[PDB]
C-alpha cells in the first residue's frame, strides 16, 4: 500500500472503515452520515502517515493541523479528537521520540508496573508520556525479560527473541527507525543432514517437505470440514490429527494394493476357466481326429453312409478347431492383461523409515515454531493468529535484540532486583509487596492507584504461587490461565574463533534418529557476524534437555557438527551458553501457545482488568485497579515482541482513560 492508505495498513487498521475501538470513541461519527465518516478516516490516515514519515520527533496537534488541508482541516475540534485518540492508544507518538512540549510539571496518578519486559516498558513509557508517575518492579538484574542477549567481547547472540517477523504492519518498523537496530534478512535455504552426517538428497528433501505441507492442510480439512475436533470428550490436538491423517494415508496405500492384486486373481481365474475349457477341447479334438482317421481308412468305393461319416467327422473336427482357435486366441488377450497389471504395481509403502525420519524433522521445526510438542496444540485454534502475519521477509537483530528494551528503559524509574510477592488491590487503591532478590528479608511496600501486571503466563501458572493476589483472582481469570498453554524452547550458543561452515548458509538442519528425539539439536543458525553457531532444542526434547549439564549438551553439538563437517574441522568453542527457560523462575517457559481445550478467546480473558469489590457495602461501583498486559494478553499477536509491545500500549491507553479522562468523545 502507498499514501495515507499505507499509513492505515502500517498501523494495522482498515483504511476505508472505522474500527470498533474508534466506534466507541466517536459514536457520533460512525452513526452519522457517510460523508463525515470519510472525513474522519482521512484525518486518521493522514495523521498516521505524518507520524510514520518521522517517528523520531513527536507529532503534535499544532503540527497535524498545519499539514492538513481543506476541507479536512475545516473542523478543528474533530482533528483535535483524532490526534488525541491516536496519541492515547499508541498509534502515534509511541516508542522513543524527541519531545516537543516538555512534560507536565507535576504528575497525576501513581501506577506500579510489575516486570520490565517489553510489555511493561512500552506501557511505562506511555504513562509517563501522559503525565503519570510510573515505577517498574523487575525481579531480574536487567531489563528486557525474554529479550535476553548474551555479550562477551565481540560475541553477541540472543538467548531469547531474535527475529522480526516482517515489517509490513509491524510496530517494530517504527522502533527500528528510533533504535539503531541492525536488521538482516534470513536466507530461507536450509539443507538437512541425516544422523550419518551426509546431506539429504534433493529428491527426498522436496517430496517429504511437500508431504509435510500436505499433511498439514489435511488436518485443517479434518478440522474445518469434517468437524473432527473432539475425541472421547477430549479436544483433539494437532498431533492427534496428524497421527490420524498419516494412518489414513497408510490405510489407503494398503487398500490400493489389495484392490490391485484383486484385479489379478479376477483375471487369473478367468484364465483358469479359460484353460480348463481348452484342455477339454483339445481332448475332444484328439478323439475326433482319430474317428475321422478311422473313417478315412475305409478304402473306396464306399456307400453314402460311410462317405457321410468322413464328411461329418471332417466338418465337426473343423468346427472344434475353430472353437479352439478362439478359446486359445483369447488366451493371449488375457495373458497381456496379466503382464499389464504385474508390471504397474501401486505404491509399496507410504513413507519408509528413512522418509518418516525426515518428516519428523519438519514436525520438529513445527514444534519449534510453537515451542511445544504437537500433542498439546489445539487442532482448531493453534494457527488462529495466522491471518495477521506481517508482510515482508523475516529479519534478525544482528547487534542483539537487547538494544531495544535498553533503549526503552531510558528515563524510566526502574527498580531492579525487586521480586513482587503479593499484589493487594482494594476499592481505595493498591499496595504491592516485594522483596530484594539478593537478600529476601528486605521488604518493600509500594502504594499506588493502579497495578499493571506483565508477569509471564508461566509465572501466573505456578503452584504454589510465586505471586499471591489479595483478594484472589476470579475464577474466570484463573481458569483462562490454566487453559492457556505456556511452551518452552531453548538455544545453545557456540562461539568460535574461525568459521568452518558455509558462510552463505544461514541455517541447516540435523535429522534426528528417533521420533522422540526429533527436536534435540535439530536446527543450527549462522546469523551473526562473529563466528557463532547456534543450535536449537524443541518439542519434547526441550523440557528433558534442561536436566543435562552444559558440557554434555555442547558435547552432543560437537558430535553432530563433526559428522557434517568432519572431525578435523570442528574446534573447541572457548565460550558456551545454554538457555533453560522453563527452569527460569522469572519466565517458567518460553511463550504461550493455544493449548487443546483453549482458544484465542482466553487471550482476551487474560487482558480483562480486575475490579475490586466495594469497601463499604452499598458503596458505588469501584474503579478497575489491576490491569494485565503482556505477550499472553493479545489475541492477534501472541508469543511475539510486537505483541507484548502492543499490549503495553493498550493498557497504557486504558489506564490513562480511567485515571486522566478522555475529552475526545463529544
Amino acid at each position: 500500500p502507498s499514501g495515507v492508505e499505507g499509513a492505515a495498513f502500517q498501523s494495522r487498521l482498515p483504511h476505508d472503515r472505522m474500527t470498533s475501538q474508534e466506534a466507541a470513541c466517536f459514536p457520533d461519527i460512525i452513526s452519522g452520515p457517510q460523508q463525515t465518516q470519510k472525513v474522519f478516516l482521512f484525518i486518521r490516515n493522514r495523521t498516521l502517515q505524518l507520524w510514520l514519515d518521522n517517528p523520531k520527533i513527536q507529532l503534535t496537534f499544532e503540527a497535524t493541523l498545519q499539514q492538513l488541508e481543506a476541507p479536512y482541516n475545516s473542523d478543528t475540534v474533530l482533528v483535535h479528537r483524532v490526534h488525541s485518540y491516536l496519541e492515547r492508544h499508541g498509534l502515534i507518538n509511541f516508542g522513543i521520540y524527541k519531545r516537543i512540549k516538555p512534560l507536565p510539571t507535576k504528575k497525576t496518578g501513581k501506577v506500579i508496573i510489575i516486570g520490565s519486559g517489553v510489555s511493561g516498558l512500552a506501557a511505562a513509557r506511555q504513562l509517563q508520556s501522559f503525565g503519570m508517575d510510573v515505577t517498574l518492579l523487575e525481579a531480574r538484574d536487567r531489563v528486557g525479560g525474554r529479550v535476553a542477549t548474551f555479550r562477551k567481547g565481540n560475541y553477541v547472540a540472543d538467548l531469547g527473541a531474535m527475529v522480526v517477523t516482517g515489517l509490513g504492519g509491524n510496530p517494530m518498523a517504527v522502533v527500528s527507525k528510533q533504535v539503531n537496530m541492525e536488521l538482516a534478512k534470513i536466507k530461507q535455504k536450509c539443507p538437512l543432514y541425516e544422523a550419518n552426517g551426509q546431506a539429504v538428497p534433493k529428491e527426498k528433501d522436496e517430496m517429504v517437505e511437500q508431504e509435510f505441507n500436505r499433511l498439514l492442510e489435511a488436518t485443517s480439512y479434518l478440522s474445518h470440514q469434517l468437524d473432527f475436533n473432539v475425541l472421547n470428550n477430549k479436544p483433539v490436538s494437532l498431533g492427534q490429527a496428524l497421527e490420524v491423517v498419516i494412518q489414513l494415508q497408510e490405510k489407503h496405500v494398503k487398500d490400493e494394493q489389495i484392490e490391485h492384486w484383486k484385479k489379478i486373481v479376477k483375471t487369473q481365474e478367468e484364465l483358469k476357466e479359460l484353460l480348463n475349457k481348452m484342455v477339454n477341447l483339445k481332448e475332444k479334438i484328439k478323439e475326433l481326429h482319430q474317428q475321422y482317421k478311422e473313417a478315412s481308412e475305409v478304402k473306396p468305393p464306399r456307400d453314402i453312409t460311410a462317405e457321410f461319416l468322413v464328411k461329418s467327422k471332417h466338418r465337426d473336427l473343423t468346427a472344434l478347431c475353430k472353437e479352439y482357435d478362439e478359446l486359445a486366441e483369447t488366451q493371449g488377450k488375457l495373458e497381456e492383461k496379466l503382464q499389464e497389471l504385474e508390471a504397474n504395481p501401486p505404491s509399496d509403502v507410504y513413507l519408509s523409515s528413512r522418509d518418516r525420519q525426515i518428516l519428523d524433522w519438519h514436525f520438529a521445526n513445527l514444534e519449534f515454531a510453537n515451542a511445544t510438542p504437537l500433542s498439546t496444540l489445539s487442532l482448531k485454534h493453534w494457527d488462529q493468529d495466522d491471518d495477521f502475519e506481517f508482510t515482508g521477509s523475516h529479519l534478525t537483530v544482528r547487534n542483539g535484540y537487547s538494544c531495544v528494551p535498553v533503549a526503552l528503559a531510558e528515563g524510566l524509574d526502574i527498580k531492579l532486583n525487586t521480586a513482587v510477592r503479593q499484589v493487594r488491590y482494594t476499592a481505595s487503591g493498591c499496595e504491592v509487596i516485594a522483596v530484594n532478590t539478593r537478600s529476601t528479608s528486605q521488604t518493600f511496600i509500594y502504594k499506588c492507584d493502579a497495578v499493571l501486571c506483565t508477569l509471564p503466563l508461566g509465572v501466573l501458572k505456578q503452584q504454589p504461587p510465586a505471586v499471591q493476589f489479595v483478594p484472589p483472582l476470579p475464577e474466570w481469570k484463573t481458569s483462562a490461565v490454566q487453559r492457556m498453554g505456556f511452551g518452552n524452547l531453548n538455544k545453545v550458543v557456540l562461539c568460535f574463533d574461525r568459521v568452518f561452515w558455509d558462510p552463505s548458509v544461514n541455517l541447516f538442519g540435523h535429522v534426528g534418529s528417533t521420533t522422540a528425539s526429533r527436536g534435540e539439536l535439530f536446527l543450527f543458525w549462522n546469523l551473526y557476524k562473529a563466528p557463532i553457531l547456534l543450535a536449537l532444542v524443541a518439542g519434547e526434547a526441550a523440557g528433558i534437555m534442561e536436566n543435562i549439564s552444559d558440557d554434555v549438551i555442547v558435547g552432543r553439538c560437537l558430535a553432530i557438527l563433526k559428522g557434517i563437517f568432519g572431525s578435523s574441522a570442528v574446534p573447541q568453542p572457548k565460550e558456551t551458553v545454554v538457555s533453560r527457560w522453563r527452569a527460569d523462575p522469572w519466565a517458567r517457559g518460553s511463550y504461550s501457545y493455544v493449548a487443546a481445550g483453549s482458544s484465542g478467546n482466553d487471550y482476551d480473558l487474560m487482558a480483562q482488568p480486575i475490579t475490586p469489590g466495594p469497601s463499604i457495602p452499598g458503596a458505588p461501583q469501584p474503579i478497575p485497579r489491576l490491569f494485565f498486559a503482556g505477550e499472553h494478553t493479545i489475541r492477534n499477536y501472541p508469543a511475539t515482541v510486537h505483541g507484548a509491545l502492543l499490549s503495553g500500549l493498550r493498557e497504557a491507553g486504558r489506564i490513562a482513560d480511567q485515571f486522566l479522562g478522555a475529552m475526545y468523545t463529544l
Binding site: 469434517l226 489389495i258 487369473q268 479352439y324
Partner: protein, 133 residues
C-alpha cells in the same frame, strides 16, 4: 471443500480409525492379512494355470485338416442329395453345418433343398427324429 490432491480423508474412514485406541493398528493389520491372503492365492492359481498350460503343449497342430477349397456348384447330384438327408438327420436346421458337409452347396441352396425335396424326402419326419436327440 476437498482434501489436498493426494490425501484421502472420507468421513467414514476417520471414524473407523478413531473408534478406539488400537483401532488404527487393527485396521492396518486386517489389511495386511487380506493382502497376504490374496497374494498367496495368486501363486496358487499361477501354479494351477502353469500346469494346465503344459497340458496344451503342442497346440492342436497334429489334429488340423487341410482346407478343402472346392468351387460351389448348383446341380444336386444323386450322391449330394443323399449326403444332405443324413446331414439333416444329424444336424437338424443347422444350414451352415449341412453346407460344409456337402461341400459345394451354399447356405441358401441348402435352405431351398429344405422345400423342393421336403415332399419326396420326408424331411419333416427326418427333422422330427432329430428333435428326439
Amino acid at each position: 471443500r476437498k482434501p489436498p490432491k493426494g490425501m484421502f480423508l472420507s468421513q467414514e474412514d476417520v471414524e473407523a480409525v478413531s473408534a478406539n485406541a488400537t483401532a488404527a493398528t487393527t485396521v492396518l493389520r486386517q489389511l495386511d492379512m487380506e493382502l497376504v491372503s490374496v497374494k498367496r492365492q495368486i501363486q496358487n492359481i499361477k501354479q494351477t494355470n502353469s500346469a494346465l498350460k503344459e497340458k496344451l503343449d503342442g497346440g492342436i497342430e497334429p489334429y488340423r485338416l487341410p482346407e478343402v477349397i472346392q468351387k460351389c456348384n448348383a446341380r444336386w447330384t444323386t450322391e449330394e442329395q443323399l449326403l444332405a438327408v443324413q446331414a439333416i438327420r444329424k444336424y437338424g436346421r443347422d444350414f451352415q453345418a449341412i453346407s460344409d458337409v456337402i461341400g459345394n452347396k451354399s447356405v441358401v441352396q441348402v435352405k431351398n433343398f429344405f422345400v423342393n425335396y421336403r415332399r419326396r424326402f420326408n424331411i419333416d419326419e427326418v427333422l422330427q427324429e432329430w428333435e428326439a436327440e
